């Protein structure tokens, strides 16, 4: 989408995976979807280093709306859980230097059952602009027609543009098109800043595997269309929660960087381990994800329960990620000729290789003819950066 | 098995899940199956608190043998990887106050392809006794009929007995007859100290779920046969490795206690996090697993992606474990009338409830009318001990 936004993958926090559609502010006050939750999460984004690391957008997912529209047909925030409304929450977020994301649906209803935007696209776009929203996640539930789906996504895109307000437009168009026909990605990119391709993530290693496997399987369709202003979205980062081991968390961070994915944390910043914080705030790995060249990475190799992925970066650098998919035993040895990496360019005549994950270590100079030997933990990933040099 | 052993579930360390059948001592000398590896684990079992916690048996799994038997038909350990021989390794292990487990197969080969014990049962038993072995894991690969499977497991049982040495006998009998015929657990118990029921574990949450699910599904026929001298074996603890989250590790520890399972760690004691060490050495949770009554726990409830399991303990005490099987979102609230716990006698007229996992906390006195409210992390378990006030 040619709107001057998302020139690098958008970074921020989105409530869905960790907080879902909890409406019980009586029995579950700390996890219910409320202005207080977003206020507190905003504060922590500032005070705990997230904004400095790059996490800029504080985004509300589904279940923020009142059951009805108002007397003017405009969307409202629920009056019990968001008494001060979206406009004032938007002021609170901007005063902290952050930006605000909100959520809406192409259909008659949102996935959770609240008012959809079908037939109100221009009204909703303007309300979002008037409120000072900075990002829109636009879902695809309760749309049974292919024509409607495409029409709605296109219409809303233009409707946002017409408000004159800079709003990152996050689409679920391709995901909700899979049931009808293969998506046209040139068209989707024309209208969207990023796009969900695959099923909702959850707090499990199974879910990570499935996203990587789908992405690698479909990579000839989706990799080359990614670039500044239009990214593939493999869904939220779930590092910091309950279901991934340390190594699985490392795999997610590594591969989301390799994949030029948007980085939307879905976790609780009030209760997050120092280990997870440091991984999520890892300057070098974020720098890979945010590389200005903006070329999405891909799977180079697959075999013997190993995968090798790589991503080209600016200034002749490459990130290389090696996964061990064997879920039994101990650290497994993997070796590759550095001339097979980075299309034969990375280490010609030589490169300097720095290991970034699971720990940071300078590995040294590698000649074009030489071999990189690495040990990889089960369900873990080793992430390296290759700097082309003459020394 | 009426041999005076495994009066509580056997506790120790077994190499398989973490080290498998690595024969490459040339390229990976510190992780290949060798005399050195078990020496290191033995030392660490003493110096790092494992023995004191209860982990007593240092057990060798498959891939310790030489390819051939010797010219007398006795099994041998691999000459390069185990240069001093098993007996010498047993001497070492005993000098540290520990006990030694070895591995063998009822069929024509071990699962990894080394000499099986079929037709050598009495010879092998005696060799193991002469070596000073203290435990035998006896697998079921390369056995072509149910009759010879049963015959072999029975024969070896008696053969071990007749050596006059005390040897914990770990069977895989039920696992290998399950696909063809329902097992008679009364018979298995008669011959075995514990028995593997289900597929090999690995370093994943998927594998943990599968074991729990199979165990709960089959509980009507395996729970009541367990007791001092005969335990159900849901396989090794994999806490300390790579594939389980903290909460999934907690779930394994909690449920293995509830299940009166043998506690065989399979990990690397040279590289293990303080978090995992403390969970594996948790005095209160081990005390549940080791409860002298020896009555296996069971699933009480299942619904709304929650499970409740419970185990009766000595002196009118109970353990209760609550699992959250929903793998999305955050800590979920679960509530239950304490009168539904412990068959209605745990908290009559009252009980004192101490949460043990994921952290230890006194919860206080609960009346027979009361309700236990708890929040449980996704893929996590909360473990409580109920003390009847009387
Ligand atoms: C509504 O839709 C229209 C049409 O798509 C859209 O207008 C487009 O906006 C982009 C970016 O704002 C314009 O592209 C710019 O062109 C100018 C002049 O050539 C460049 O200077 C811009 O900067 C580039 O280079 C800079 C170097 O320092 C970089 O910092 C910067 O990131 C850019 O790479 C940029 O290329 C584009 O020209 C228009 N298109 C048209 C047809 O006018 C509009 O913004 C949409 N949204 C809204 C809210 O109106
Ligand atoms: C080989 O098999 C025989 C027969 O099963 C075993 O004998 C049994 O050994 C146990 C444990 O020592 C005896 O139990 C004990 O009995 C005494 C007194 O009755 C009691 O004080 C203890 O608390 C315990 O119950 C058991 O009675 C005995 N059974 C018989 C029938 O003799 C023997 O242990 C086995 N030998 C080896 C080397 O495995
Ligand atoms: C919403 O419902 C109306 C009334 O039945 C219908 O006309 C319209 O097609 C529905 N919207 C979508 C996206 O199908
Ligand atoms: C995809 O859409 C674009 C823009 O609408 C169009 O020009 C192009 O031909 C389409 N591609 C295919 C393969 O249909
Ligand atoms: C072992 O092999 C022999 C010879 O092939 C065969 O007769 C016997 O049935 C086998 N025994 C078992 C237990 O599989
Ligand atoms: C199981 O085996 C025991 C002991 O061998 C025997 O007494 C019992 O009757 C058997 N039960 C069945 C159902 O075959
Ligand atoms: O119900 C909300 C839900 N809708 C569908 C999306 O794919 C999810 O990420 C989430 O936004
Ligand atoms: O080959 C060894 C392997 N055999 C099968 C057993 O069930 C496993 O636990 C392990 O001991």
Curated annotation (Swiss-Prot), chain A:
MF-aspect GO terms: alpha-galactosidase activity; catalytic activity; hydrolase activity; protein homodimerization activity; signaling receptor binding
A single GO cellular-component term on record: lysosome
Effect of residue 212 to F: In FD; uncertain significance; decreased enzyme activity
InterPro entries referenced in this protein's UniProt entry, alphabetically: Aldolase_TIM, Glyco_hydro_27, Glyco_hydro_27/36_CS, Glyco_hydro_b, Glycoside_hydrolase_SF, Melibiase/NAGA_C
Residue positions the entry lists as glycosylated: 108, 161, 184
Effect listed in the UniProt record for changing residue 123 to T: Does not affect enzyme activity
Main location: other
Listed result of changing residue 156 to V: In FD; decreased enzyme activity
Membrane-crossing segments per the record: none
Impact upon substituting residue 248 to E: In FD; mild; does not significantly affect the enzyme activity but the mutant protein levels are decreased presumably in the ER of the cells
Result for mutant: residue 90 to T: In FD; uncertain significance; decreased enzyme activity
Pfam name, any one: Melibiase_2
Substitution effect: residue 296 to R: In FD; loss of enzyme activity
Effect on the protein upon substituting residue 171 to Y: In FD; loss of enzyme activity
Regulation of this protein's activity per its record: Galactosylgalactosylglucosylceramidase activity is stimulated by saposin B and ammonium chloride.
UniProt effect for mutating residue 133 to L: In FD; uncertain significance; decreased enzyme activity
Outcome of substituting residue 330 to R: In FD; severe
Binding site for substrate: 172-176
Subunit structure: Homodimer.
Illness association: Fabry disease: Rare X-linked sphingolipidosis disease where glycolipid accumulates in many tissues. The disease consists of an inborn error of glycosphingolipid catabolism. FD patients show systemic accumulation of globotriaosylceramide (Gb3) and related glycosphingolipids in the plasma and cellular lysosomes throughout the body. Clinical recognition in males results from characteristic skin lesions (angiokeratomas) over the lower trunk. Patients may show ocular deposits, febrile episodes, and burning pain in the extremities.
Family, per entry: Belongs to the glycosyl hydrolase 27 family.
Stated name of the protein: Alpha-galactosidase A
Organism: Homo sapiens
């Amino acid at each position: 989408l040619d709107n001057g936004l998302a020139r690098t993958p958008t970074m921020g926090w989105l409530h869905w995976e960790r907080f879902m559609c909890n409406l019980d502010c009586q029995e579950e006050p700390d996890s219910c979807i409320s202005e207080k939750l977003f206020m507190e999460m905003a504060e922590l984004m500032v005070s705990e280093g997230w904004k400095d690391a790059g996490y800029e957008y504080l985004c509300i997912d589904d279940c923020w709306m009142a059951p009805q529209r108002d007397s003017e047909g405009r969307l409202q925030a629920d009056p019990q859980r968001f008494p001060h409304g979206i406009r004032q929450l938007a002021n609170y977020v901007h005063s902290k230097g952050l930006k605000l994301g909100i959520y809406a649906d192409v259909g008659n209803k949102t996935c959770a059952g609240f008012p959809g935007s079908f037939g109100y696209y221009d009204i909703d776009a303007q309300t979002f602009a008037d409120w000072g929203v900075d990002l829109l996640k636009f879902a695809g539930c309760y749309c049974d027609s292919l024509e409607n789906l495409a029409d709605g996504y296109k219409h809303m895109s233009l409707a946002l543009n017409r408000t004159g307000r800079s709003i990152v437009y996050s689409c679920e168009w391709p995901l909700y098109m899979w049931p009808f026909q293969k998506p046209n990605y040139t068209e989707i990119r024309q209208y969207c800043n990023h796009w969900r391709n695959f099923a909702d993530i959850d707090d499990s290693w199974k879910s990570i595997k499935s996203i990587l496997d789908w992405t690698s399987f479909n990579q000839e369709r989706i990799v080359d269309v990614a670039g500044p202003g239009g990214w593939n979205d493999p869904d939220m980062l779930v590092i910091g929660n309950f279901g991934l081991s340390w190594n699985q968390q490392v795999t997610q961070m590594a591969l989301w960087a390799i994949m030029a994915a948007p980085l939307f944390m879905s976790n609780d910043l009030r209760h997050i381990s120092p280990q997870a914080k440091a991984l999520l705030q890892d300057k070098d790995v974020i720098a890979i994800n945010q590389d200005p060249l903006g070329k999405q990475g891909y799977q180079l190799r697959q075999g013997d329960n190993f995968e090798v992925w790589e991503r080209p970066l600016s200034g002749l650098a490459w990130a290389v990620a090696m996964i061990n998919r064997q879920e039994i035993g101990g650290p497994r040895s993997y070796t590759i000729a550095v001339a097979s990496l980075g299309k034969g360019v990375a280490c010609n005549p030589a490169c300097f290789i720095t290991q970034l994950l699971p720990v940071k270590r300078k590995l040294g100079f590698y000649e074009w003819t030489s071999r990189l030997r690495s040990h990889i933990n089960p369900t873990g990933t080793v992430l390296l950066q290759l700097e082309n040099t003459m020394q």
